[PDB]
């Protein structure tokens, strides 16, 4: 049923000529996002994937001890909408990269993104200031769907302008060591690429819509590291922004990276279909 | 590493 495989996932975590398109869920998020995320299948008889628990925000199993001391937060004292060079939070980000529509400026370096520090609850500014985008949550109309060749994937139902926040990679925050012994590694996302005390998000047991975004070698999304309610640099949050105009109906994709394909390429090849595919 | 990891 709707819950049978969700429960099973929760308990495993605790222990450790085509068909007419069918709507298999009106909302995979069960009302937890600002808009529904429907699930459809125009390919076969498979029900909506349910062997995970949908969560809209990161969770933990074993404790992570994120620094949440409010007095440690850098904040701004702006009397405007945080559009000026006087904003501390923009300075921490190099500049505020968001235009008035909430979209990344053309100058934003998508090949080597900076860290973004959004305004927070210690700032003097108001909740509607310019430097608040990822913290406003999923806005775009997305859909989980059955692909022909690549299991489930995510599409946009509407045009998404370049530089728009699409969704966050959400899941269970775990250590590098715990990640190294997870039986299913397909949903792991490293928070930092260096050696030492580094952390991961595992979206296998707990995740959001982003867990179904397939890899693409010429991707329409780029992940960016973002700080909002805390500034513990061990725990950036992963926000996907569009790299170009994404047309209504288009599948979302991002570049999983070499730390994925170094392992998985030994088992199967990329089928993204790009003329510039780097993993087939 | 022992397991696959997506990355930024
Ligand atoms: N470009 C690509 N080529 C081949 N397989 C892909 C792919 N992108 C994602 N996948 C598959 O999807 C897994 C990542 S999870 C992404 C959602 C997945 N399609 C699902 O139905 O659950 C990968 O390990 C691989 O099995
Ligand atoms: Zn400010
Ligand atoms: Zn601020
Ligand atoms: Zn502000
Ligand atoms: Zn490819």
Residue numbers in the entry:
A (entry chain A): 949 to 964, 972 to 1235
B (entry chain P): 4 to 11
The authors write:
Intriguingly, our structures of GLP in complex with mono- or di-methylated susbtrate peptides reveal that residue H3K4 is making 2 hydrogen-bonds with the D1131 and D1145 side-chains of the I-SET domain, which suggests that H3K4 methylation may lower binding affinity, and reduce H3K9 methylation efficiency. Several aromatic residues line the GLP channel occupied by the substrate lysine leading to the catalytic site and contribute to methylation state specificity as previously noted for several other HKMTs. Unlike I-SET, Post-SET is absent from the PRDM2 structure, which lacks co-crystallized SAM or SAH. (3) A more rigid conformation in which the I-SET domain closes onto the substrate peptide.
SET domain methyltransferases deposit methyl marks on specific histone tail lysine residues and play a major role in epigenetic regulation of gene transcription. HKMTs catalyze the transfer of a methyl group from the co-factor S-adenosyl-L-methionine (SAM) to a substrate lysine and, with the exception of DOT1L, are all organized around a canonical SET domain. Methylation of H3K9 in humans relies mostly on members of the Suv39 family, namely EHMT1/GLP, EHMT2/G9a, SUV39H1, SUV39H2, SETDB1 and SETDB2, as well as then non-Suv39 enzymes PRDM2 and ASH1L. Here we report the high-resolution crystal structures of the methyltransferase domains of GLP, G9a, SUV39H2 and PRDM2, and propose a structural mechanism for substrate recognition.
